[PDB]
Amino acid sequence: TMIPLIYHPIYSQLDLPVGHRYPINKYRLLYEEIVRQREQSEAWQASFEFHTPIAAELSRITPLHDPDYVQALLEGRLPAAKMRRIGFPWSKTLIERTLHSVGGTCLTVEQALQSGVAIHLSGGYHHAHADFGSGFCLFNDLAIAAHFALSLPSVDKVLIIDSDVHHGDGTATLCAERDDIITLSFHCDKNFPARKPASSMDVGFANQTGDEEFLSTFIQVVEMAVNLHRPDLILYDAGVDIHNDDELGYLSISQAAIAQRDRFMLGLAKQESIPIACVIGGGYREDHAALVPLHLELLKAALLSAGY
Ligand SMILES: O=C(CCCCCCC(=O)Nc1ccccc1)NO
Ligand SMILES: [K+]
Ligand SMILES: [K+]
Ligand SMILES: [K+]
Ligand SMILES: [K+]
Ligand SMILES: [Zn+2]
């Protein structure tokens, strides 16, 4: 009944202009909120433990990403226009953060294999492709972690379930020609990115889709994809940019429905005895801390699911 949480203090240590769209403080604030829950509550103290990652090895990245793309980012030589498409100014701290977060999704996988359920307090970089970055993504932690997971003995088949409001295009292109990683994306069709190469299965929702349509579809599609593919491991992107107050997403999902989504996902994995490694994914609010209660729903779901 232990739930590993994966966190590194470098996650919010990036220097960004104010006004920058990326809610860089949410990671440390979410971590601090959980630290406070643990002081307040015997249940949170007893049910969760933290695991700090070290940077991912470069050999774990280059099976998915082009080496010259990797090298250009390592050396801060990525052409200016390509770096802007990523959406961050280059710095060594950005590279160190990224590699640590990739390491973290990989650790979440090992931890999920051991305990059943593990949550990464970062991650979900589904817009990175083999040879370019976009949409705040440099390297694709989900695909990287799925490829790594397949190196392990118990795992032959990985299902990535992406509930972030944006299409997992990078993940789609990275896994399109491999039958050992299956990609499922739910998303708002009119949100970024414009071009949506096929996942294994895609569910695109109209603007202002609300709780019942989203949840009924999520429940049935996920249950089907789990039955169809019988994965050894699920990677679950629990992005909260589906939320009705998100500043980028165009869906109308409530915090209550986010909770029900996470409860359902985690409860299915448990019922089926499939290890599930979770990434908190995206979320956009100029009030970065406003994302904290939305992401915390994943933890409340895991807490309830584990039996407290
Ligand atoms: O959370 C997300 C990130 C979505 C990426 C942001 C969408 C819009 C965007 O990146 N536009 C853009 C980028 C560079 C320059 C101008 C616009 N996906 O999971
Ligand atoms: K294997
Ligand atoms: K998605
Ligand atoms: K595939
Ligand atoms: K919205
Ligand atoms: Zn998103």
Residue numbers in the entry: 11 to 318
Study text:
All active site residues were conserved, as shown by the multiple sequence alignment and the structural alignment, suggesting a general acid/base catalytic mechanism for the bacterial enzymes as described for the eukaryotic counterparts.
We solved the X-ray crystal structures of KpHdaH (1b), RwDmhA (1b), and VcHdaH (5b) in complexes with SAHA to a resolution of 1.95 Å, 1.75 Å, and 1.64 Å, respectively. As described for mammalian Zn2+-dependent HDACs, the hydroxamates coordinated the catalytic Zn2+-ion in a bidentate fashion, the carbonyl oxygen replacing the carbonyl oxygen of the acetamide in the substrate and the hydroxyl group replacing the position of the catalytic water molecule. We were not able to perform inhibitor studies with VcHdaH (5b) because the observed de-decanoylase activity was neither strong enough to perform Michaelis–Menten kinetics nor to determine Ki/IC50 values. Whether VcHdaH (5b) is inhibited by the HDAC11-selective trapoxin A analog TD034173 or recently reported HsHDAC11-selective hydroxamates needs further investigation.
